[PDB]
Design a protein that fits this description.
460 residues, alpha/beta, binds zinc ion, hydrolase, esterase
Length: 460
Amino acid sequence: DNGKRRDVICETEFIYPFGNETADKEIEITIHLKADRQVGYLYTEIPTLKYNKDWLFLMTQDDCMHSAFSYTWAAIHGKPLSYIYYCDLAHLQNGDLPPDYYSLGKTLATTNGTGQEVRFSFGTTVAADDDLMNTQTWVQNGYTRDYFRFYKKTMLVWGNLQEMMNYGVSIAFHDLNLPDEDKTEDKLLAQFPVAQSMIREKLNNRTCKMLAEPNGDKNYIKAALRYDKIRTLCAQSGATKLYPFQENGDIEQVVIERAFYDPPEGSGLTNPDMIKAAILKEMENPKEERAAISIGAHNTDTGWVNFLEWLNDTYGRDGDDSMWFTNQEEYYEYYYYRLHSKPEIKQVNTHTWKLTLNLNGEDSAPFYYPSVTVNIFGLKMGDIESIKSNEDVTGLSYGDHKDFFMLNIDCRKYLAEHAENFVKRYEANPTDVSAKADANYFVNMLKDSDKKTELKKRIE
Ligand SMILES: [Zn+2]
């Protein structure tokens, strides 16, 4: 019965197997040149920003907000949106949508510089030790007497967050669930692994490695720095302002500055208005002098949806494609690779070169964004007869960029299986246009292979 009320625990049918991700990657890419395109010398680098982007936008949404799913994630990923209501995952799965629902008609993304979509990425804080994440969702297709089931919940339900993990959304600690008088440095330190155990239980054994400082409370930073699973942190004060082209040191356990860009009281402006103004001011400088635009958000809304669309239209795929819009965890990992991984290219014979690189994360937990860009100077796409790669490479896209050649290399161990899970979801929901779009998006992340060919055929 489609019209009967059900109260369910939101659940998604697969979650990327974060616990199984391999910590160490060994990249070997073999480049075979055309006969009359023998080159004498090639050399390589990992550029400052992934995809050879010019500038960095970081976004972390605090307070484990329902709108992180219903507004932020939904707008990026081409999902149904509302102007005043808050869908849960089960509403989307069942087609029980609020009475004002609409869609932007596109996802919000940059490209990777080699012809593929890269949807905007962000992080959300998680109230993992708070039982309110276990709240049920009321689903009732066709019920119009009221819309209470679409009201804002106090925080995300676990199923919403689980699904967001499938799209690369990151996670951070924030407030911990202790009495206020027990929020001492020592007691917060003991509670971090308790919250971590719940994160791992619910998010397929993903380990959280980030703290977003809550309430300006420096006890959280002091405690977090004694908990070695946390590798990156953000705060509005007591932090380091990130200049991506200038930062030269280790950022392990460093507090990166973030700002909320609150508008002056009664000025009629919104946080997105303030962030837009800050972006425009920053873009007047040469890229090497620019600070990262490192933002926090609380509740997101229609104004935020329109702002994300403006970013897409101005600096993303429908604009100048100059921005890397990501979460702080993915950036932290990329910076780590750039500092510690050393790509090398060696000539094998007159017409064959081999590019090698290791991606090794930190000893605490496996890094979850093992993808990099490598530039090759002295090579052009037109020189190349074929490119082959070893098993650790699961995604591989490449092409010319300015006067050199770039490769986007993804080493997520279970990427092909993840794409196939999106294909199976589409096959089970073949009339859902967004499901088909997601399947195509994830399949296009894969390197050329028999599996990619099989999955493409299934989603024709
Ligand atoms: Zn907060």
